[PDB]
Design a binder for this molecule. Structure first.
Ligand SMILES: *[C@@H]1O[C@H](CO)[C@@H](O)[C@H](O)[C@H]1NC(C)=O
Lengths: 49, 49
């Protein structure tokens, strides 16, 4: 977040937790009440066959 | 007595544009990103419906 003087005054770490994911998804530092789709769960492979 | 049949809703389908185009592919995803928001807009349009 760049303020009026072009200084970064705040930031969101998009990989910190699910709320930060929602903030980054919506391109906002404020999230309104509701349900938002932010990602996609995938089971990863553990073996090479 | 007569019967009047009207549709109300569609199947609530949802398509993940990244998984559809570049399913589990890092190299494809990196190329898909060159199209900017095209993928995001498609996901948004279906969510809205
Ligand atoms: C920009 O800098 C001026 C001082 O030169 C300060 O008074 C003003 O509040 C600053 N603007 C912001 C958004 O911090």
């Amino acid at each position: 977040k760049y303020n009026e003087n072009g200084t970064i005054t705040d930031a969101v770490d998009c990989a910190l937790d699910p709320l930060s994911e929602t903030k980054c998804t919506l391109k906002s530092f404020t999230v309104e009440k509701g349900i938002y789709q932010t990602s996609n769960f995938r089971v990863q492979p553990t073996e090479s066959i | 007595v007569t019967t009047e049949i009207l549709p109300v809703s569609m199947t609530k389908t949802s398509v993940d544009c990244t998984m559809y185009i570049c399913g589990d592919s890092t190299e494809c995803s990196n190329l898909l990103l060159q199209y900017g928001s095209f993928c995001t807009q498609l996901n948004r349009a279906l969510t809205g419906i």
